[PDB]
Symmetry: D3
Subunit: 253 residues, 6 copies
């Protein structure tokens, strides 16, 4: 009984999915996030102090709750992706995808041969529940969801080719990196950046793929939802906690 | 150069100290809290999944920041107090203190002979920074700050005599347990419990000691500060995050 | 939405519940067992190298699966029980219960005041999902399941009184401890030990309580099931693994 | 007194070595396996949730026993192999070895200069026992044992070149990856795959190198030993534990 | 094949055993000490930040080397002693032993019934190698070695009775606590303390038991060995590390 | 208030900085070293069993003390460097830097766009204290300090070019690898290596950059300081501990 990837399902549905960014890098701190009611949670392996085993611990904490886990590897390395797939991850958000050719390789990385180059060691890992899931090899590709991050000028230039790649379910726009690449580091609200984001969202959707984004700014997140983004992250756990703590302290000092 | 206990100092001054409760039990999750500007942080060893090594991890993380660490052991056991002193804790919040005789024993547990029964083993622990602190054995008692929790109806009856035990610097009022003990479980706003809490605060102050309380309710905390409490916790890190997370999701679902 | 204790429910039903003993003391090794199909899993804090934090990880790994977790503390200590309850455990197997008065104290240990002495800290703990559960304090007592171990001569003498204690849902017989107590250390199959166990099961059942036992021996486990035991543990994860591995090696050497 | 690699020695002797695959990724779960009686134990860093620190813990747990540890890195990366060498691993099973040139790079990666490119930092590492081993730098190469995995079509085509490389002590055949590569994913029993495997074993032996394989099927493993395989793994710890537990449950449900 | 307690063996031979105190509380830091050449290593569970899981890791790290491990629990608690025995510790140094009645209880705690009160759960524990050791229950007592610390005035007065207790293999003198108890806190060199220590050593030996002590001062440690101490600890790893590091800095500052 | 890199400051002053190498890979073992009085501490991610999370723990332990932390990654990989920058490291010692082109790339790895290629994810990271540091993005580059290791013949040939690179504050000479590269493995004292080192220190200094080196030999370290090295490491923590222990043991055996 192969686990169904509900996040991949809803990407093709009409309704958008609201997400939370998890950077606390702890299974206990993560179980709290699983209780908040988000449709999906992003375990960040690129900018938070996460390793394979702590990602494994967070996957265990999240499993009972409705929110769907998405893992962002530090880079789109084949060996790292292979390890993330074996611990049970079915949706990956790969950063720094600059070209269609790079994206085509990422699709092969998540597929068993003939379709791909994913190594076969499923029996030993959580992904097949240690060979409990019958016919895992024949159907695992069906439940993988690949999301690519476009965050620099070259990726923006190749956006139409990257979104076109077969197997790329979604294209994620990282306003933080894109803004800095465009010369407005730390100012994603700038109209030049906003226009690029709005144009990027349109190009992704006409290719038939889901557009995704992260905004701690809620009104800005509402704008991205209005423009048709399929998956949107509306907060960061470390930032929400850090702001809440300092404001609570500020009220009494 | 024996570390000076600033929390113990500020207690004797006229300024109250604003605090935060730490139940995330992770040195990393704990360092955000240390960055929020509080006067003291409560490492909770009674109701959070902490242990001797996680409490040590959190003490290492907080040390560079202004906030003062206070540790609440699961119970006023002597072996446990010993191990917390060795890792460097200088302020303790001992729970379930019901009688002056009991508080007398706890004073002896934080003091070296002849004034107490604390074991001589400091030289190999962090408290002496591995025997770097000169004359630690002759001065350590002066930097220990013992805080007792009155949380039931025996301790409330015996509060005047508990506060008068020499070496009890502060008496802390746990409204949750106190409410339950009074038959208002989950109902600390009940005026029977508020009447007990205020009377308790006045009696501690008249004994010349420091009155402490925790209240996640900011109007109620403000009142406890207006009544003269020397140390008031104004939040719990788990609750602020759990709250912030579930309100954010609701603004989109 | 308070978690319902399904183990407690089925104890009152006609069907016996099949269990496995977990001594591997790791969240990853424990998730394999959660996949095995047992009705309940015993997380052993007495004879396995478990602490509060490792028990917490195993509870998180087990949660998605059907099997119900039972935690066995190293002893029936009040403060330890409070910690196990706060991390989310609802069924406890307390070892070395020798007298009705001790069993009566254990019932208070799992109940909130006024009725009991369980410390109140639900907002900070996993048991309430950090206060996500509405009115957790007013209904937590209903879902606690307390099981006591009778494993020596005195407990056997007071067996009728121990099972009579209100709040003692089940009485577990420990053949290894009982065998040694009776002068047949390492020989629980001895008829004097076996005669006591059959007598013990009958006395527990006429008191209206559930009788439990652990037998790695499968024919012996069937006999205990035949005698009406409500919960029987049929294996130990360490014994099964150690035995499979050396038998596999012996076949090739 | 430099540690002698008995796995490497026995390979040069007539005797075959019986092995077990370790995917539980814990020092405690690993020490049980060290008690089972195997000639060698495969600490899997490719498909099991292992990092550098967990492999080190497993090496320390393993050391008292006769079984020899073999580590499989996630990939044959020079920096990772250097880290594995410094924690004390002397035998490596490197996956995805496709060409003789790549096999040469791995041989040099385990050799100190001039012979190789292994970085010098032994005084700081367990490999030299923190410089307790006299003239470790002059004799370490002698006890390194390099094993390469041939697991795809390109590696099979270059098998004669790979086995010919000096310093490649053994060639390991991965039936799972090779079977998928040949158009028989999940069907290694197919005669095409079995013929390819037996031909590969013969060529490895005619090249003078040890041929190795993994077979959970016990009859198939005996055939591989009968064909002259020097190192054969006859089980996987996660598979054996998972199988025993669910079958034990089935006997009672 | 039951593990033999070699520390107890050398204790019964004529030669003294040289020991080192381990307070770094990490398996990696402990393996360095095992490589140093000491007869015994003291894993300090009383004044160092050690728990059950970290003591287990240190036991695993030390096992290959000649030095024998001795564990000192934080207190002579029965539940704690049982857990320490199950993880495989065979020699315990119990602090704060004041009377023969207490020492007799400690002997029973390390003995299986009928003789003692040690709980039976060895099949699940490392002590029996998870039931690999045949008839462990019938011979485990033979390999237990119990050492008691005499460190206060009441213990000194009852020294003859304590040493007389059957099952008390050795009596350990704690100079720091005894000196503080005698009114010379921080002044163990005072002749009154030294006269009491040398008299105590004589009384222990005249009872036929091994006399033990810790002396970082090397000339004083030689005196204790010449006076007949069977086991003497000549250093503390944290003190040796801290002293070497600060002196090296001073040579360049 | 962005943390100022005081290590980078003192490099531009006349005064040399005395350092210690940390390979114990534990936050607790690291805090002892933090107490020793060194100007800088090297957390070695190349030759000690350190990962990102253990390096973060040591930074938390190190922060309260004066010594400035320097991290050496296992290799100069861009994605790895991004992870070290986000956990708060401001000084990096990058191994195996052979050419100006490679050094220029490392300068980009540590600078935010436009100047560099460092990924922007600071809100989630300790480097900005989870966005407590105001306008961290505009000043982060200002406090980064890049130190390059020249440790082989190719690096030595391009040394003047490598030191000339803008943004390379210092060039570190690794005698152990350079010794082996020159055919004198294990013999850094050989005059050919020493002639190469002394020539290198001069060429590095004429470029205006800081010259750095590690020598456990104290008289050799004095010569390196006399020759004008700005940062010199005078010891290794594992070596000092291993030496103290075995020498203490030898005195009694």
């Amino acid at each position: 009984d192969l686990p169904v990837n509900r996040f991949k399902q809803r990407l093709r549905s009409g309704e958008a999915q609201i997400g939370l960014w998890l950077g606390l890098a702890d299974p206990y701190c993560a179980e709290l996030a699983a209780n908040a009611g988000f449709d999906w949670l992003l375990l960040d392996g690129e900018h938070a102090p996460n390793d394979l085993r702590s990602l494994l611990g967070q996957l265990q904490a999240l499993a009972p709750y409705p929110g769907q886990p998405v893992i962002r590897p530090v880079q789109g390395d084949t060996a790292l992706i292979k390890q993330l797939l074996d611990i049970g991850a079915q949706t990956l958000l790969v950063p720094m995808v600059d070209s269609a050719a790079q994206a085509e390789g990422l699709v092969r990385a998540v597929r068993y041969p003939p379709a791909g180059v994913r190594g076969v060691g499923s029996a030993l890992a959580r992904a097949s529940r240690w060979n409990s899931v019958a016919e895992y090899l024949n159907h695992a590709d069906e439940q993988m969801c690949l999301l690519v991050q476009v965050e620099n000028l070259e990726g923006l230039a190749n956006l139409d080719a990257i979104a076109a790649v077969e197997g790329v379910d979604g294209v994620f726009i990282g306003p933080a990196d894109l803004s800095a690449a465009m010369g407005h580091r730390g100012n994603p609200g700038h109209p030049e950046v906003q226009a690029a984001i709005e144009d990027a969202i349109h190009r992704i959707r006409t290719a038939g793929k889901a557009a995704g984004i992260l905004s701690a700014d809620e009104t800005l997140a509402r704008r991205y939802l209005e423009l048709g983004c399929a998956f949107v992250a509306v907060g960061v756990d470390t930032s929400l906690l850090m702001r809440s703590l300092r404001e609570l302290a500020g009220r009494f000092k």
